[PDB]
Design a binder for these strands. Structure first.
Lengths: 196, 30, 365
RNA sequence: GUACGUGAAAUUGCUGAAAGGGAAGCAUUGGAAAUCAGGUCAGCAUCAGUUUUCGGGGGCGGAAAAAGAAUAAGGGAAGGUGGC
RNA sequence: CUGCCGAAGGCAGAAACUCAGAUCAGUUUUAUGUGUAAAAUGAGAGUUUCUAGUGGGCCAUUUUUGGUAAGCAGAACUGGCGAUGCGGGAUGAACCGAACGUGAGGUUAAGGUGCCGGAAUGUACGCUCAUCAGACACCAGAAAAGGUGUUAGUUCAUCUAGACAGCAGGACGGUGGCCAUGGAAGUCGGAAUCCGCUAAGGAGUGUGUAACAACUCACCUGCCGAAUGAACUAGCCCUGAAAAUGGAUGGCGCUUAAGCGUACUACCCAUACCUCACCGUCUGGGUUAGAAGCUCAGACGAGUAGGCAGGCGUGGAGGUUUGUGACGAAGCCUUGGGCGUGAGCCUGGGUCGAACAGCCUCUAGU
RNA sequence: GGAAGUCGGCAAAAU
RNA sequence: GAUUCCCACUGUCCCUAUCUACUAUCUAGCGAAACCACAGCCUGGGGAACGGGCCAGGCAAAAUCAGCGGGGUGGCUUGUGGCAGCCAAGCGCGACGUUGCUGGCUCUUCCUAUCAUACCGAAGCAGAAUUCGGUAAGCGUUGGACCCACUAAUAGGGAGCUGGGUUCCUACUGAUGAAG
RNA sequence: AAUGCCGCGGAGCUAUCAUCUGCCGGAUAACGGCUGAACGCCUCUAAGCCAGAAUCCGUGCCAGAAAGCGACGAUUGUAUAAAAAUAGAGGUCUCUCCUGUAUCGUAGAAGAUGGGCGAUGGUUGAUGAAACGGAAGUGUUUUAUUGACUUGUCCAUGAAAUUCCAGAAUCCAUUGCAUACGACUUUA
């Protein structure tokens, strides 16, 4: 709980509204936020109801120049951005600057796949939803509302998980070597009465 | 999204008219 | 209050805005789906609308009202000189779309394609691609690296090809350069095919084969600013909406004619291209007196059914159909019987001067 | 300099400074730049007035808390322990 | 320009003088029946006189009669509005708080603490899943009710003499009872609907057959081992119709809530409350060591009609300032400085060229 | 093709 | 003179197309006026009058050109009538039942409460043809004097013009256009 | 001869008065079923599944953000990277989680100058070469050569009166595939 320049949030298993509210409060506090893996955000309510909610959202359009009408964004990252910006005073310079401090992406791009990704417990579905309750996935609602990049993200995420697993195995082996040398070192038992 | 056909929010004449005519209903049943 | 007498909408909402196309060359907004089961093959070609004529062919259409009768059809003649492959582009699939990772160019670029990079070729010092030619001569290992990058990371392979506009009887000297996606095979196979096709010409004889169904795409003729009458077919307090027909640009829009049949792919070097098995009578596809406002066709040409967008001497793109559609019209063969090459500059009455001379008397000249 | 004392405002041009994504104006606080002016600004201690927030000690009340613990009687049993 | 007093649907103020009173009260007790009379608390109480403005209306409240599909109409009182800014209810003439001088600090009311938004994604116990949920606000119009949705209850039922259900079986013989008929045997159709046996087999619950026949229940036996059933009430949930462009619990959104109900803390801030400073008005005490002054103390502060008082500025007149001025009067411009709550005043710089100003009175084409 | 338009041969053509 | 009829004629019409001149366009010169609190996007709300200013949202990027003229009062309501009696779940009423009697010519879009087309369920539905009902508004719903044809059908509604009857700016549409 | 009148009349324009062209993937609604409880039977529904309308969403087609972007060409202490589930995970039959209050790092006149003792390590800088990383590769490893500093431990010097916080394009010209004017398409 210390002020970092950039917080990378792995949005897997989170709730859209709860994560948006927490992020919107951090941006007004003046913190750069990168919400990666937005195709895994969870929304309460069963999938058919959520798709009806979204398909009702498409209905809002101008009767003159739908080019000026409401802009319906189908990407899961843009869905999260719409949720976040609705919780911000974006009509003012403060809120407009706050939006510039948020980077919502699909998947985990290489500039952010090699950085620690914290999670928000106040938005996690496992901790915040009663078991036995129906929910949906934004990355699934997006595919059946118009989003057309689901397959590429899934493929590029399988590659990323494979590479990350290889990296962790190498780091775990090095950590095992360091861990083995730990008790071999003597001061770790000689004067460890301080609790370390 | 509202996801409704009829808005759940009410106009000020409409909300005021309830207390106008709900009281009269109690007057009538009295 | 409801509308008393209803009619269908005077226009099509799927073709607006009726604005001028931001391009003169027909854009391919969709290439046919790729498959690794089939190895390499191209999918598009670039030609010039020379002119249009009419033909007579025997219709073998089972079940038709005119089965095995002689039918007359209008045909469009597009001159298609071979195009030179001068580049390859690699496209990588990203969660944001297809992105051009890198581009590799051939060492020797003709003045035809070099003119495309300038608005004024004569004033320029012609410095384009000079250092690229230098590095190509010095070290080929670098170029091998980008091709290795293309075959290792890129998912879509496209070849930059330019048309030899010099061969055509056109007053324009700039060559039209476009990308044709190499469909089929592995990415490595496409990269190799591009390499061994660098600086060589690919002809319509290798792209299309005289019977398939293609999509012809181009920019239509310009009719200028027009009122609601001919732009749209026109006979409560509010503000005017986008659906209301209005006065503005009519013509010069990017269009796509689907399901065009090649009736014939003729070779320029052959002098029998306008002759059929029922006709003999040695002649060329160019009509008597030359095509009106285009010239004489001397290269490979394609004869499509019906009419294609745009006036004469405009560039058209011919692509393979995205989706297979096995209508018996798209599957039947074509056996030409007669081709009309009379003078289209007026009421022509003779096919060739040779056969006109016997009927006419001995002209004093 | 006669289109002539002094020569305001509306309005206009130039120069310099600044701002500008479907209004502009104004007010409050402060920053930034410019400018003017006169001792200026701090820290701590001991106090007084107002006030907020923690901590300790001591009485006095209730069924002289109720409980509870420890320890002697008797009674009852279980959601029945060892045993049977 | 500022200050004070301040309405009206006979008032508010001014002046003239009573009594230091039992003299009055939009009040409550006591006694007699909302009337009257004689303890509580508060307040200094008063009488004659004249003189501005107004005599309207909207909203709600409780008392009645006439009423009707349905609202509705006519009275009396009460307040709020009108003359009233401020906090909250997303915003608002009538809803919840709160009556306003300039500031500092503290604390609250109403409403709130997921984000927009200052404040607990607090604690504790329950309810609810809605393919057009809820945040609504006597849930009053639809409203009478429907639901194999859920959670609680209330009243009657059988149950290790074996409960409900489940499978196995019996579910009969007089009799195909009698009229009724092509054909009707319990089951097209007309009254019952009796009996031998029981533990039970209904002149028969339905299907079916031309008629039959066959199966089923409603009725009993075998196995199987524990709870089960019926009728009502309550809360939430679905439904209980509504159209015409996009769409609104304020938005985003929220489903062990950020919805519904309760309980307990903590927290947020109004011009409201408290402490202090200051401004002004009023009131009271004192003052012979600009009296038109000095001094101490307390309370008070919206303001239309209206009433009263004190000041700023303009032209001209009388008096005065040994008043200002070609070494620059008046005027004008100014991102300069200063004073006053304000009307306004002084001043620096520039321009400019011949008059001008303070103080006390007078005067007005101010 | 020949008033099928319009409330209707308004206006042109038949001369 | 009016009316009717038959013949005759023709861009009134099916159904518009083409051609010419002028204007409009640009340019050189000259050069106004009306009007003007300020202005300029829409949706829902703001008790009303909803408005452009207020609330909550969609949005929002200089400077411009040519067109065209848009903008200057119940949460009502719907499909089932009036009188009397018999019950009677229940709390004198009493629900359902039950019985007694006499304006038209063209126009953008939306709603479904669907005439046709698509797919389903039921019916003595053998087949064909058909009836009713469900999802369904994607797409159509004509030509002539209620009449007679065509058509698969000729379904119902919400938000420029003429006849008989009374004595600037903004929007929409196209066209440029400085700029990281 | 104000297009005197008439016939034909290329080019252009144009006519359902002429010719051509108009396509396939998911998710569902009514509805028909599978398994299967609730309720020891049954049941299309409660958890799940299948088929299913001209319907909805995409593909295709048009436009291209003039404040979205990529490739190509020429160029006059800013410390910490598995994944997945939560009615379960991982490690060697056994053990661990039950939160980062953790881990790495952390002295020095802002990091000075020397002396030892102990180890071949750490910080690594500079270059030099190998490999890897394309989703926006914003970098990663591997080294090599060295120049450094080497708190590992133990000693000696100085700090202070900072004496109480602060090469191109365009105009002119040309073209007619275009056109009110711009723009566009060519030449130059």
């Amino acid at each position: 709980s210390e002020f970092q320049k950039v917080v990378v949030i792995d949005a897997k298993g989170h709730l859209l509204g709860r994560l948006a509210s927490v992020v919107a409060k951090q941006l007004l506090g003046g913190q750069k936020v990168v919400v990666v893996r937005c195709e895994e955000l969870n929304i309460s309510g069963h999938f058919f109801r959520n798709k009806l909610k979204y398909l009702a959202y498409l209905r809002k359009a101008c009767r003159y120049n739908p080019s000026r009408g409401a802009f319906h964004f189908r990407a899961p990252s843009r869905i999260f951005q719409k949720a976040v910006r609705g919780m911000l005073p974006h009509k003012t310079a403060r809120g407009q600057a706050a939006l510039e401090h948020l980077q919502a992406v699909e998947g985990i791009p290489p500039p952010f796949d090699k950085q620690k990704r914290v999670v928000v417990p106040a938005a996690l579905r496992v901790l915040r939803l009663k078991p036995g309750r129906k929910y949906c996935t934004v990355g699934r609602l997006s595919s059946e509302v118009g989003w057309k990049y689901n397959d590429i993200v899934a493929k590029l995420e399988e590659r990323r998980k494979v590479k990350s697993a290889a990296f962790y195995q190498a780091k775990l082996a090095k950590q095992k070597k360091i861990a083995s040398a730990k008790e071999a070192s003597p001061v770790n038992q000689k004067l460890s009465q301080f609790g370390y | 999204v509202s996801l409704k056909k009829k808005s759940k929010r009410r106009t000020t004449r409409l909300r005021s008219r309830i207390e106008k005519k709900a009281a009269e209903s109690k007057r009538k049943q009295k | 209050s409801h509308c008393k007498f209803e009619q269908p909408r005077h226009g099509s909402l799927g073709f607006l805005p009726r604005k001028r196309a931001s391009r003169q060359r027909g854009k391919v907004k969709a290439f046919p789906k790729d498959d690794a089961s089939k190895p390499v093959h191209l999918t598009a070609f670039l030609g010039y609308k020379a002119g249009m004529t009419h033909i007579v062919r025997d219709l073998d259409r089972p079940g038709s009202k005119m089965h095995k009768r002689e039918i007359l059809e209008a045909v469009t003649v597009i001159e298609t000189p071979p195009m030179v492959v001068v580049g390859v582009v690699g496209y990588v699939e990203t969660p944001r779309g297809l992105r051009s990772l890198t581009t590799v160019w051939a060492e020797h670029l003709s003045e035809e394609v070099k003119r495309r990079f300038y608005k004024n070729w004569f004033k320029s010092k012609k410095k384009a691609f000079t250092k690229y030619a230098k590095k190509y001569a010095e070290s080929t290992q670098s170029i091998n690296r980008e091709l290795e990058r293309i075959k290792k990371y890129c998912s879509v392979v496209r070849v930059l090809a330019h048309t030899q506009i010099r061969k055509t009887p056109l007053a324009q000297k700039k060559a039209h350069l476009m990308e044709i996606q190499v469909n089929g095979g592995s990415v490595a196979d496409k990269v190799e095919w591009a390499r061994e096709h660098f600086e060589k010409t690919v002809d319509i004889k290798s792209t299309f084969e005289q019977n398939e169904m293609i999509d012809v795409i181009g920019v239509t003729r310009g009719k200028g600013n027009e009122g609601t009458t001919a732009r749209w077919g026109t006979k409560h307090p509010a503000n005017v909406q986008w659906t209301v027909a209005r006065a503005g640009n009519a013509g010069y829009m990017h269009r796509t004619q689907l399901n065009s049949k090649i009736y014939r792919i003729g070779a320029g070097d052959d002098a029998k291209n306008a002759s059929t098995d029922f006709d003999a009578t040695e002649k060329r596809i160019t009509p008597m007196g030359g095509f009106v406002r285009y010239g004489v066709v001397e290269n490979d040409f394609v004869m499509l059914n019906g009419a294609t967008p745009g006036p004469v001497k405009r560039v058209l793109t011919l692509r393979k159909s995205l989706l297979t559609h096995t209508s018996r019209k798209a599957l039947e063969p074509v056996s030409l019987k007669w081709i009309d090459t009379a003078s289209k500059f007026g009421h022509g009455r003779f096919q060739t001067p040779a056969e006109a001379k016997q009927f006419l008397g001995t002209l004093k000249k």
